[PDB]
Amino acid sequence: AKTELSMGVASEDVTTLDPHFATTTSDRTLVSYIYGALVRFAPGSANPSSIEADLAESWESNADQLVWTFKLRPDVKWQGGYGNVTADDVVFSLDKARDPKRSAFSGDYAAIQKVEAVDAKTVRITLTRRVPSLLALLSNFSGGFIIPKKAFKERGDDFKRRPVGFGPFQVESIQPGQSVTLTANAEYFRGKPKLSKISYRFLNNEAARDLAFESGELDVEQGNQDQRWLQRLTANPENVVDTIEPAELNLLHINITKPPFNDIRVRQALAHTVNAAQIAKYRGERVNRAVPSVIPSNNLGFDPDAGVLNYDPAQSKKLLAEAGFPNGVTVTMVASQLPGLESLAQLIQAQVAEGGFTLNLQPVEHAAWHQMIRKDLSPIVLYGAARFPIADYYLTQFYHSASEIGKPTQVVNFSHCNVADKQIEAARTETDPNKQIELWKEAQKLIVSNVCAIPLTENLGTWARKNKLGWGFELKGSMPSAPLITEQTYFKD
Numbered sequence: 001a002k003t004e005l006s007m008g009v010a011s012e013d014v015t016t017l018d019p020h021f022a023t024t025t026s027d028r029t030l031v032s033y034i035y036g037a038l039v040r041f042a043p044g045s046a047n048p049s050s051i052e053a054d055l056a057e058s059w060e061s062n063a064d065q066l067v068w069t070f071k072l073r074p075d076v077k078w079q080g081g082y083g084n085v086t087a088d089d090v091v092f093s094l095d096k097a098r099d100p101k102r103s104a105f106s107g108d109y110a111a112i113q114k115v116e117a118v119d120a121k122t123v124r125i126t127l128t129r130r131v132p133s134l135l136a137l138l139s140n141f142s143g144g145f146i147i148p149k150k151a152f153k154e155r156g157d158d159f160k161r162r163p164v165g166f167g168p169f170q171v172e173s174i175q176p177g178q179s180v181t182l183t184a185n186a187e188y189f190r191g192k193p194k195l196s197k198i199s200y201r202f203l204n205n206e207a208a209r210d211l212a213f214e215s216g217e218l219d220v221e222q223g224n225q226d227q228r229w230l231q232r233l234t235a236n237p238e239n240v241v242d243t244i245e246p247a248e249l250n251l252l253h254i255n256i257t258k259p260p261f262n263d264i265r266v267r268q269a270l271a272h273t274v275n276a277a278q279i280a281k282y283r284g285e286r287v288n289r290a291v292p293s294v295i296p297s298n299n300l301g302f303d304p305d306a307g308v309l310n311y312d313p314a315q316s317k318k319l320l321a322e323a324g325f326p327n328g329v330t331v332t333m334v335a336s337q338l339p340g341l342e343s344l345a346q347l348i349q350a351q352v353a354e355g356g357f358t359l360n361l362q363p364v365e366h367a368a369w370h371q372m373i374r375k376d377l378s379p380i381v382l383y384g385a386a387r388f389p390i391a392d393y394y395l396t397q398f399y400h401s402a403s404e405i406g407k408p409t410q411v412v413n414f415s416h417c418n419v420a421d422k423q424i425e426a427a428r429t430e431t432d433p434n435k436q437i438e439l440w441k442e443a444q445k446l447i448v449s450n451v452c453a454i455p456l457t458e459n460l461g462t463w464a465r466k467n468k469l470g471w472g473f474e475l476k477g478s479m480p481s482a483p484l485i486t487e488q489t490y491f492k493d
């Protein structure tokens, strides 16, 4: 049968295939095909209850949950002839993942004191203090992916373009700004993939990607957040549409240190002229939902009563006049050209005019935009993301003062939020389910009332596949909100 898969994504190019840096949906998707981790989510699940053995066959923890020991499978081979995956590779990968100079995700691993290779198949992880879930940090997402020490040392700066994993697919070549050619890893420990090749194509323009999928040029295509796309794609019986967990939350992160937004009244005015319920209704309720807090709704610790500011543009105009702006405010936002973020920025632009805001949009290619926002080049950041569904992840990365832009510990705190540090830190080490949740809720209320970030809608991942393609499992979720392609993915006869 057919063994070559063609896939079209809303992206211009590959930025990095080093999993300690892969941040864009497209880079994270490619990284999920190439690498594995000590533990993994079950294929087709984005649910932490599915976390199971991957490179690590089994594990043990002590009673205080500070010392974790992992027993590695002995049969796991690296791609590109780097031999067996050893405890030394895990030590190197995790030491790199927890280093802010060699990883974008070091903050997640702050509690790790040391990572030791007890023997060639045994890894011991020692924590300084308790974490909500150590297994979460070691799963096949963000900094959890394992890389070879020897391959990274040899390739250095080229590793991001010539990745080496133990996953079911390997990168054969990159055609910059066009595609990534992946081939089956014949030595994959769970068995040889049914697919021989993946042609992963950069087709950012939605109308062009839709034409390529309709003609049969693509077997898989990324969709958008519009219910019209969903309806059109379902109408043709040769297609299957997938709405994938987790939902990515979009927020307007306001830099609270920059005038005019250093006055809480101006931030409140903006929050009162945004209409998240209207965005969800306009886009479609099956894929989109307004979120009554600053973290995604599927998070453990989510606050449905965080106190989100209501739609009242008459109050926005009154607050602006009180702040010394009787004829409104003009704001210039550096906006991503990822089509979903672009259309969302345009809906916000129309909405905020009601409350006296003239929002100007400076469009920039998605990956370049990712680095500009991380240099404080935008007064407001329209950012979309899902994290491991424990409140600590989203809260720390986006709203803890250590994560603010300009610090060596920076993550994605574009707002420069510093009002919930105590609550975030306290919740991390609290083991009681209810007490931990209360601290997370307190943090959400403080972030909302300070108007550090304005929540909009969260969106499930939307993809279309041809009938002939089988994922090899039921696809409910995948941590990057993009389909997972494994050794089980195949074309039907």
Ligand SMILES: O=C(O)CC[C@H](NCC(=O)[C@@H](O)[C@H](O)[C@H](O)CO)C(=O)O
Residues within 6 Å of the ligand: 023, 024, 025, 026, 225, 248, 249, 250, 338, 339, 340, 341, 344, 383, 384, 385, 386, 459
């Ligand atoms: O993980 C991250 O830090 C960022 C992931 C992020 N993923 C894209 C994303 O969230 C989009 O789906 C937007 O929510 C959507 O297009 C807005 O309508 C990105 O590539 O920007």
Ligand SMILES: [Cl-]
Residues within 6 Å of the ligand: 010, 011, 012, 013, 024, 025, 026, 027, 366, 367
């Ligand atoms: Cl991208």
